[PDB]
Design a protein around this ligand. Structure first.
Ligand SMILES: *[C@@H]1O[C@H](CO)[C@@H](O[C@@H]2O[C@H](CO)[C@@H](O)[C@H](O)[C@H]2NC(C)=O)[C@H](O)[C@H]1NC(C)=O
Ligand SMILES: *[C@@H]1O[C@H](CO)[C@@H](O)[C@H](O)[C@H]1NC(C)=O
Lengths: 48, 49, 49
């Protein structure tokens, strides 16, 4: 990486910065709110 | 660190930054020029012996 | 995504006390750092990657 972030092939004696170790994303999930909003479909399907 | 400040650790913004190119290497080769003079300022003020 | 707050990060556990009418958390950068899950009533954490 010090051959890659410096854009050369021969480097000299020293200390260089390349990148960091931030944690990369793996997945995409979702948690929304409770519903408590059921339609009145009991009489729609279970009327006598 | 450049990508981190400009882009919030994402992927779509990290790829787009390369289109601008070397706007940032110029930035971290200046704040590494400053951050080596500070180690040089103290070495010539206190370390004469 | 918690209640429509899009973001990417590592979700850990915290113990911050939030008032019931006080949902989102901010910081010096005016960014969402500590949130609360909509289905339950637990404050998750202030933890990026
Ligand atoms: C959505 O609400 C229902 C009740 O209307 C929750 O069901 C129960 O809720 C009580 C009180 O919160 C809990 O003590 C029980 O353990 C719950 N039972 C089950 C089977 O969940 C339901 O939990 C709520 N949804 C969420 C995601 O919390
Ligand atoms: C109608 O009755 C059946 C039989 O118990 C049940 O399975 C179904 O859930 C009922 N319909 C509704 C909308 O609850």
């Amino acid at each position: 990486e010090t051959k890659c972030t410096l854009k050369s092939f021969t480097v000299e004696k020293g200390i260089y910065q390349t990148s960091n170790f931030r944690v990369q994303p793996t997945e995409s999930i979702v948690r929304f709110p409770n519903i408590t909003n059921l339609c009145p479909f009991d009489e729609v399907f279970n009327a006598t | 660190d450049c990508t981190m400040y400009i882009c919030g650790d994402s992927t779509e913004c990290s790829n787009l930054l390369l289109q601008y190119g070397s706007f940032c290497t110029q930035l971290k080769r200046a704040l590494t020029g400053i951050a080596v003079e500070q180690d040089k300022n103290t070495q010539e003020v206190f370390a004469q012996v | 995504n918690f209640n429509g707050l899009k973001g990417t990060g590592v979700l850990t556990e915290s113990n911050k006390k939030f008032l019931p009418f006080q949902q989102f958390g901010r910081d010096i950068a005016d960014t969402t750092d500590a949130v609360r899950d909509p289905q339950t009533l637990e404050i998750l954490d202030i933890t990026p990657c």
